[model samples]
Target: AHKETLDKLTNAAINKINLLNTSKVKYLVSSAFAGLYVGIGILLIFTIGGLLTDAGSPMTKIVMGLSFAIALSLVIMTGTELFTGNNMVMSAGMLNKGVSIKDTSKIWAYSWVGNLIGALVLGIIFVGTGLVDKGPVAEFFANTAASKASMPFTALFFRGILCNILVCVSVLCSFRTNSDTAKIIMIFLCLFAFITSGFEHSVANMTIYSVSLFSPTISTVTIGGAIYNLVAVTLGNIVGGALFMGLGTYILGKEK
Candidate 1:
């Protein structure tokens, strides 16, 4: 019934309330888990996708996109607060009027910073392990990061919006399903769509550029480029989740 989705909507808001009230320490730690989870996924991306891209396989892009699903799968199943996912569920709550702008901003800021901390820490470890230090892997990483930064901000910004629409739709639709299989397949397919499309996701970039920054071999990537990408994509993500996915959808179904 429509009522079921309505129920999920209300419950989603309740969950945000709980997240809102959690100690700063707890929320940040939770967000870090999400960031580090993404870190782990990046390893799979470059190790597998990096090698494939190095070899010039047409399969490279598809596999890389699919590999990212592993990260989001962990994040969704664990309730870890990846900022992009929050862009969806949190927006859902706000549209219901269960949360205010202030509450929304607080959770967003804490999670973004915490997620950044985790990504940076993982980048430190990823580089220290010498896994991506100096080789084709680092070269691929550097080129990719530089390319991402070099893309026009307008395109990246639009891609950012497109990326979250798929993401938020995944979460929203997942709530409407009871099948675990449906949830997994839905998430994986949606994730694959964006990664293949070369969409800009702010949290994923944290993993992408952070590793690029720490690895000395990746000379093309710069802090400035990373910042540039983040600002553009982050704002795009905010619009994607808060307005396009959340309030806009909410308004569409309104009875009035």
Candidate 2:
């Protein structure tokens, strides 16, 4: 058991590096899978969590928080690509494994596009099916989307910073442990903290906003609002994942 975490961190990054070198297509596929998986989590929150919301209970945040953990758990266990996650992974790889900036850039670009595609594709069919066209589910989703879209700039920025710090920490915690039980608990715990606090995650917003775009009753969420949220959240994610977790851990853990 090494005291240093750099080895485990770089090992995870190298796996990402090898995945890129092996097949960019596969990398894209993995990234897409992450989006789909995240959609599943989003589906649960708005479906089950929506009903819970209708009850006017105080536990709405709890349900919403735990639901998103499904996405990260599936992504982590299955080795899928997620942009918020790759934020930390690529940064660690670049810093610790001495990987070039080009490789990191490729991963980020491909991962974000792949995530968007998968999320939009799911939104297409989900709305097409008339699943959430009206009623409480549609109401809850529309209300939240519009609020997030128009949320103040500084609040979104700070929340974004808070969200990805937990995300990167969760991923790294999984890398540190070997036990499946411990791994899942750590992941669940960290994500619950972020989502419960109502922090913004760019990839998650992709699913939420894209789905709202297709909703007949949900006209409040607009393209411009979606763009603004993503821009603000993305910047905060970079600072939290790359600056705080990735590079900060490297400087603290690596034996200089």
Candidate 3:
């Protein structure tokens, strides 16, 4: 047992080091995959969670959020390239002395493309499956998407920036400790903060994008809003993660 612990620690340490040493190309692909997984996970959560949370109590909403993050954490930490996590990772990675600027840019691009693909595919599945088709459930999803898309540009932009700040903060907290449970708790706390505050996440938008694809009642204006929100949030996420975690820390003397 003692030897097993030593072996695991050695392996984890090596993995971290190897990740730091990861070539630009490998990181790019990995980042993309991560983004796709995140987008899909968020979409699934929103579709199902929206229904459940609405039907349930206040505790239920909290539970829904926690369950969403925890379930997605599997995809988030394992191999899926979730947009939020990937974005945060790239920014955090660069700021942490673990990656370079070129690598970060590539990772961001690859992950975004992958997330878009993942969301589109998942969206098609949701619409085609008749899961959310016909009934109050379908209307719920439509209403949610429409409302989100209708927000003023100023509100959406500020929400985007605020959302990513919490996302990066959560991701950053996870990296601070060696305990897996602790990391999960920290991530949960931060994610909960974002969700409860109603902050926008670009990856989550992918799923909403997909949901709207099939809902005819949903407006073109809503679709435009979703994309617009993403643009602002994406920029914010980059600044929060890249500046706050990536380059910001370096300037603070953590890397030196």
Highest lDDT: which candidate? Answer: 2
> Which 10 consecutive residues of model 2 have the lowest summed lDDT?
1-10
TM per candidate = 0.93, 0.93, 0.74
The TM-score obtained by model 1 is 0.93
The candidates, ranked best first by lDDT, are: 2, 1, 3
Each model's lDDT comes to: 0.80, 0.82, 0.59
TM-score of candidate 2 against the unseen true structure: 0.93
Q: What overall lDDT, based on C-alpha atoms, would model 3 receive against the true structure?
A: 0.59
When 2 and 3 are scored with TM-score, the better candidate is 2
Off by over 4 Å in 3: 1-36, 40-63, 86-89, 92-100, 216-223, 251-256
Per-residue lDDT of candidate 3, residues 1-256 (tens digit):
3233223323332343355356645644554455455555565556666567667656644654565565346553774455554555554445443555666665566567666766676677777777666665566566766767777766666677777777666655555556878767777777777776677777777677677766654545455677776786677666665555444433444423
Write candidate 2's Cα lDDT for 9-117 as tens digits: 7776778768878988898888888888888778778886678889998898898898777878888888788988788878877887656687788777888898888
Q: Note each model's CA RMSD in angstroms.
A: 1.8, 1.8, 5.8
